[PDB]
């Protein structure tokens, strides 16, 4: 008690004198990545760390996004995790997430063009899972609204790096650091050639992705594995969001390989500017209208080899002999 107050005074003096080594990094930095299974996100995260490991352990991992705080020559990490289709492992966030981690929330997302329409659907599913996790917290909603106000201010503060809100400005209110990416765009030319991913269709896909991101209040970066597009830019954006670094390069929409529109650098009209580009299809063309579900590989169907059973053929031939 008295010794508790004494060691507390010791700790208070320690916190006061901690200014010598203060501002080292965002304390409790831990990240996450949303999605369903088949993301192939192991390589994405490895390139994100710049490392390489094919250790695709199912469920998730405490992926150590080593945060080399080189601006102050400090260092940290970020306990990252990826999301799969393991609904049996839906309780991973129960192991993973926490109330402090709720303040320390850091989420990521990426892309894969194979089921890119379903990748939007899978993003919706992962978002639903995340919202379920958020609800499972059952935490002080006053703090929830406070962080919502802070995030709304940041979106208002999300100016062009040289006002009123939209109808659905983060309708899926993230209220947390959430990343997205239009990553893994290696077979884009193959998609246009074979899957009929038209240039108008691909632009509409990008625009609808932006629209859905804004509906969740999100931003994404185009990339591909061989491209390694915006990887340093992604790290800089991550540091700017969580670690509070200064994002340097201006966001662009010209770069097909590395389209990374900054959050708040565009608005509903900027998407509406792209929304007019839907020439051949209607401006509200469904992703399902443009989706592909090819039934490849000719799945078995080996005739179900069977005949009349023992008593079955017994009665069959018995009736046959009755006829005979």
């Amino acid at each position: 008690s008295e010794e508790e107050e004494g060691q507390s005074l010791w700790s208070s003096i320690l916190s006061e004198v901690s200014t010598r080594a203060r501002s080292k990094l965002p304390s409790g930095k831990n990240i996450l990545v949303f999605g369903e299974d088949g993301s192939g996100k192991t390589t994405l995260m490895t390139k994100l760390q710049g490392a390489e490991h094919g250790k695709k352990g199912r469920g998730l991992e405490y992926l150590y996004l080593s945060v080399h705080d080189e601006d102050r020559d400090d260092h940290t990490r970020c306990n990252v995790w990826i999301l799969d289709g393991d609904l049996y492992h839906k309780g991973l966030l129960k192991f993973a997430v926490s109330a402090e981690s709720l303040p320390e929330t850091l989420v990521i997302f990426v892309a894969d063009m194979s089921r890119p329409w379903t990748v939007m659907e899978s993003l919706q599913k992962w978002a639903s899972v995340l919202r379920e996790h958020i609800d499972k917290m059952k935490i002080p909603p006053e703090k929830m609204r406070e962080l919502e106000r802070k995030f709304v201010k940041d979106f208002q503060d999300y100016m062009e790096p040289e006002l009123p809100l939209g109808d659905n400005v983060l309708t899926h209110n993230l209220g947390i650091p959430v990343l997205v990416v239009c990553t893994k765009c290696d077979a884009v030319s193959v998609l246009e050639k074979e899957h009929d991913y038209r240039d108008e269709h691909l632009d509409f896909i990008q625009s609808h992705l932006r629209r859905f991101c804004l509906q969740y209040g999100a931003a994404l970066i185009y990339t591909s594995v061989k491209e390694e597009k915006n990887l340093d830019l992604l790290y800089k954006y991550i540091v700017h969001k969580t670690y509070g670094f200064h994002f340097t390069t201006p966001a662009l929409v010209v770069e097909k390989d590395a389209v990374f529109i900054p959050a708040g650098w565009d608005n509903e009209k900027k998407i509406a500017i792209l929304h007019e580009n839907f020439t051949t299809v209607k401006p509200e063309d469904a992703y399902e209208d443009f989706i592909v579900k090819p039934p490849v590989r000719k799945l078995v169907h080996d005739k179900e080899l069977a005949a009349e059973d023992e008593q079955v053929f017994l009665m069959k031939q018995q009736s046959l002999l009755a006829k005979q």
Binding site: G57, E61, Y62, L63, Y64, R77, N79
Partner: protein, 48 residues
């Protein structure tokens, strides 16, 4: 006068998670039975 870790505690946690994952892979690594390997006709690849 500024103490550190060998390695960082996050590094240790990652190593422990890797060890647990390796233990799990000790079971999971057993391939699914190649019953379709008897079947022929397509030079496809078996899934995970």
């Amino acid at each position: 006068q500024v103490i550190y870790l060998n390695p960082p505690i996050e590094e240790c946690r990652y190593k422990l998670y890797q060890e647990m994952f390796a233990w799990k892979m000790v079971v999971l690594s057993l391939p699914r039975i190649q019953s379709q390997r008897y079947q022929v006709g397509v030079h496809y690849e078996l899934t995970e």
